[PDB]
Amino acid sequence: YEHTAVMPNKVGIPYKALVERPGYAPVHLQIQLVNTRIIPSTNLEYITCKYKTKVPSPVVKCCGATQCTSKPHPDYQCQVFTGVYPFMWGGAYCFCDTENTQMSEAYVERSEECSIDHAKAYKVHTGTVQAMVNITYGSVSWRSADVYVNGETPAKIGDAKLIIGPLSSAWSPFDNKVVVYGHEVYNYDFPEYGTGKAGSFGDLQSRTSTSNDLYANTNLKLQRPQAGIVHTPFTQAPSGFERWKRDKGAPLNDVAPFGCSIALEPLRAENCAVGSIPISIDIPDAAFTRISETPTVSDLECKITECTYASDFGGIATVAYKSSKAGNCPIHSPSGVAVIKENDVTLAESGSFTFHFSTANIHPAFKLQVCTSAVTCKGDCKPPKDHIVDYPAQHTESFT
Amino acid sequence: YEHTAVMPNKVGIPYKALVERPGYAPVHLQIQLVNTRIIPSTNLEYITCKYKTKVPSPVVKCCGATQCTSKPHPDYQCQVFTGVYPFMWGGAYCFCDTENTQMSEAYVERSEECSIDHAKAYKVHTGTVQAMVNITYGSVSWRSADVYVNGETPAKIGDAKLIIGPLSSAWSPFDNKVVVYGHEVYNYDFPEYGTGKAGSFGDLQSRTSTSNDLYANTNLKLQRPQAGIVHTPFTQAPSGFERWKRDKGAPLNDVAPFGCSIALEPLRAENCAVGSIPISIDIPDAAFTRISETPTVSDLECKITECTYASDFGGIATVAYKSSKAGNCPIHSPSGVAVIKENDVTLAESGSFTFHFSTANIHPAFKLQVCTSAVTCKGDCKPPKDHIVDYPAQHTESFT
Amino acid sequence: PYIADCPNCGHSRCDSPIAIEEVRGDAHAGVIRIQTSAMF
Amino acid sequence: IATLAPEPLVEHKHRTLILHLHPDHPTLLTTRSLGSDANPTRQWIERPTTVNFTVTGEGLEYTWGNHPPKRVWAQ
Amino acid sequence: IATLAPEPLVEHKHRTLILHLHPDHPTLLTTRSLGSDANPTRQWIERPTTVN
Structure with a gap:
């Protein structure tokens, strides 16, 4: 009875399949893939952020030169300068007039915002998708368990053992190269660590926040201070992190395909509705009811009464139930034409009980399996009027 | 002069290309890919290790039953037992004879060796390969820098800017699924977290060492203690970590293809000699010598004298150097037929100086570019006798 | 309280103790963090 | 304490x-x-504008500023 | 007091x-x-073996 089932990847709607175990009473499913969070394999390549030209205070030798050296600070720009007369609080102070030397030095450093407000590149591989699958199973009526997709993983949470996927729809909405910012995720071809052109994205490129080493192509060019005054002309491109916040591109949670949402959290891409998942469950046999205890319902009749050719469960149909015992009777349309809101219907001794459903074909000729009794609920449906609210329960469009 | 060069991926041998900048004197390369450590993108999926059936001490109620409950310990096996008479230091102690109850409980727990002696699964993606490329460049004579492969990364360590790859030979010797053990790495289709059949590999499956939760399919089945004595029959498969150490498979550093070595270190696969790498360098123009300062060497002559048709630099050839000035003269065979040990040859006023080389064609008709002067060093070579030592410098086998 | 060279100190370049360096209009909340050379 | 744009007129x-x-x-x-x-x-919208969106069968979503994202069945 | 071999894996x-x-x-x-x-x-089995 290990109920294999191909199953559409779509998040917010149950998939009430039916266990046709030969010998005992069938049992309905209710498989709602409440989430499709993905979490691909990734690598933190480098944080970037806007620089801060945290200038070390220049040297001023008063009569003669002060040769600079290339200190190992990131992008340590330093250039000796002569021909000053530095006004500092008493007019000038160095008594020479051309031998007055000024050595400006400036290096690039991570902002304090780099720790917290920072873009973040990644080389993104495929990884392994997940889900908090609820099944309000059978008469168990509950399990809300986190699972995987790889087609040999069980998750014995509740009582049922369930194996999912691998899904066929391998579209990772993440591209190979991704930039990430706070919550807005950008599938951007970031240039690389170690290379980013100044002004362009990644002018600062630190491996992480702690990493004292980095790559700072900022085109930081010191110029001589003017007219014998102490200061430090640092001529520099404002960061490619400054832009990339107001001349950027749009976020993947606003431009992705096939229906995904995003988080700066394990780097999941939630709820990506695409393709199917070959899902298979091993039910606990204890949860089964033996066949000789559920009422046999045959010699019945089914008919629509007001079929709504729609998404919400507007389709209805009375069923002239013709039972033997009285009790519950799980139901399902093995044809995917009709999706039913009721998993189970209570029965007195051969009464009648309408259920709700939804279809996509004008003439819904769908079988209905009322606990081992098939029936065609043939009829005709009506279009609605009022179509602006969230996503459907029908999801069965085909040739009609 | 940004000297693009396709370049074979092979670790322990320089690649002394030649910079043919039009206008100034050429300069030799010496590009030795000292390492090819890989570091693919990976994910720690679960540690495994051998269990320890760290039995909690059973209950013994003396007259009547003690119902057990399913405590949440990993693989918490517990089974009530009656019909005992437990000999404990005074003969038995419970005065009944069948109402003597014994409740055995045992759960699975990580060994103390699990922290330290533990296999380790991974889902392995491709990542990004690296190298500590030495170039004893030109007259610079040194840089030993760690680089990347992605074909826009520079590494300005030394004075030269160098861009490597991407390599064409994307064989990650790691498979998708890998198990890892101490240093021996196994490209094993580990079953998964959460599933591993008892006895088989991964009977214990902990996410990490700290992770108190795990999956312990050990088929732990308690049996009743014998003949009224206190003890705990735990019937269990010795671990799939016990086997997998003496009925395992061989390691990827002993079964890989295309020439790799391995470490339990960043999970690199060193020195994978396969394919070519499109490498391109931007030399410092200061390192160039202008053309009007190196001797012009033309009106020369070249000839082998004892060519060794071999790997070690056994091939030799005098060259009737016909110089103008006297000094150094970088050399290279632009044809890949001949690989030369000398990058540079000193020259007096039109002397002669033999160099060493190695070839693969019986009639080596290779050009030799002695600092802007080509020459065919045609001749014939001799096979050696003594072939059992490490790897060659020739690496140029073709149709001969 | 350090004193440095303010750039347009009312008239022109004076040496104010409140000489402004490291202006940071990088947050969002209408706020700027500033450093005077003066230590109030 | 942050922004919010006036609600849309759904038609x-x-x-x-x-x-x-x-x-x-x-x-x-x-x-x-x-x-x-x-x-x-x-599109940044500062000038009031009647816009249009060809919604498909399966759905569209809609983000009026930092107002939360909406969603729509257009069968 | 006597022998017992670990249980089999039935497949x-x-x-x-x-x-x-x-x-x-x-x-x-x-x-x-x-x-x-x-x-x-x-067959005496001392080496672990998948049999049929």
Whole structure:
């Protein structure tokens, strides 16, 4: 009875399949893939952020030169300068007039915002998708368990053992190269660590926040201070992190395909509705009811009464139930034409009980399996009027 | 002069290309890919290790039953037992004879060796390969820098800017699924977290060492203690970590293809000699010598004298150097037929100086570019006798 | 309280103790963090 | 304490959202046609504008500024 | 007080028992196909072996 089932990847709607175990009473499913969070394999390549030209205070030798050296600070720009007369609080102070030397030095450093407000590149591989699958199973009526997709993983949470996927729809909405910012995720071809052109994205490129080493192509060019005054002309491109916040591109949670949402959290891409998942469950046999205890319902009749050719469960149909015992009777349309809101219907001794459903074909000729009794609920449906609210329960469009 | 060069991926041998900048004197390369450590993108999926059936001490109620409950310990096996008479230091102690109850409980727990002696699964993606490329460049004579492969990364360590790859030979010797053990790495289709059949590999499956939760399919089945004595029959498969150490498979550093070595270190696969790498360098123009300062060497002559048709630099050839000035003269065979040990040859006023080389064609008709002067060093070579030592410098086998 | 060279100190370049360096209009909340050379 | 743009005027058409819209300030609107064909849109809106969106069968979503994202069945 | 070998791993196939097996010591396994064709088997197993 290990109920294999191909199953559409779509998040917010149950998939009430039916266990046709030969010998005992069938049992309905209710498989709602409440989430499709993905979490691909990734690598933190480098944080970037806007620089801060945290200038070390220049040297001023008063009569003669002060040769600079290339200190190992990131992008340590330093250039000796002569021909000053530095006004500092008493007019000038160095008594020479051309031998007055000024050595400006400036290096690039991570902002304090780099720790917290920072873009973040990644080389993104495929990884392994997940889900908090609820099944309000059978008469168990509950399990809300986190699972995987790889087609040999069980998750014995509740009582049922369930194996999912691998899904066929391998579209990772993440591209190979991704930039990430706070919550807005950008599938951007970031240039690389170690290379980013100044002004362009990644002018600062630190491996992480702690990493004292980095790559700072900022085109930081010191110029001589003017007219014998102490200061430090640092001529520099404002960061490619400054832009990339107001001349950027749009976020993947606003431009992705096939229906995904995003988080700066394990780097999941939630709820990506695409393709199917070959899902298979091993039910606990204890949860089964033996066949000789559920009422046999045959010699019945089914008919629509007001079929709504729609998404919400507007389709209805009375069923002239013709039972033997009285009790519950799980139901399902093995044809995917009709999706039913009721998993189970209570029965007195051969009464009648309408259920709700939804279809996509004008003439819904769908079988209905009322606990081992098939029936065609043939009829005709009506279009609605009022179509602006969230996503459907029908999801069965085909040739009609 | 940004000297693009396709370049074979092979670790322990320089690649002394030649910079043919039009206008100034050429300069030799010496590009030795000292390492090819890989570091693919990976994910720690679960540690495994051998269990320890760290039995909690059973209950013994003396007259009547003690119902057990399913405590949440990993693989918490517990089974009530009656019909005992437990000999404990005074003969038995419970005065009944069948109402003597014994409740055995045992759960699975990580060994103390699990922290330290533990296999380790991974889902392995491709990542990004690296190298500590030495170039004893030109007259610079040194840089030993760690680089990347992605074909826009520079590494300005030394004075030269160098861009490597991407390599064409994307064989990650790691498979998708890998198990890892101490240093021996196994490209094993580990079953998964959460599933591993008892006895088989991964009977214990902990996410990490700290992770108190795990999956312990050990088929732990308690049996009743014998003949009224206190003890705990735990019937269990010795671990799939016990086997997998003496009925395992061989390691990827002993079964890989295309020439790799391995470490339990960043999970690199060193020195994978396969394919070519499109490498391109931007030399410092200061390192160039202008053309009007190196001797012009033309009106020369070249000839082998004892060519060794071999790997070690056994091939030799005098060259009737016909110089103008006297000094150094970088050399290279632009044809890949001949690989030369000398990058540079000193020259007096039109002397002669033999160099060493190695070839693969019986009639080596290779050009030799002695600092802007080509020459065919045609001749014939001799096979050696003594072939059992490490790897060659020739690496140029073709149709001969 | 350090004193440095303010750039347009009312008239022109004076040496104010409140000489402004490291202006940071990088947050969002209408706020700027500033450093005077003066230590109030 | 942060921004919020005035609510939209939702208007139905056949597989199409007319939206007479009227913000306080320039608002970046954007959408995601949830087909594997994404077909997104972006436009800062400061001038009040009646816009349009060819919604598909499976759904579209709608982001009136930092107001939360909406969603729509247009069968 | 006497011997006992670790339990087998029963695995189903079509009219066929795969048995991944893993003893402590050399264990004489044997069977009896209950047809009037006996077709028995004997083999001491000390090395773990998947049999059929």
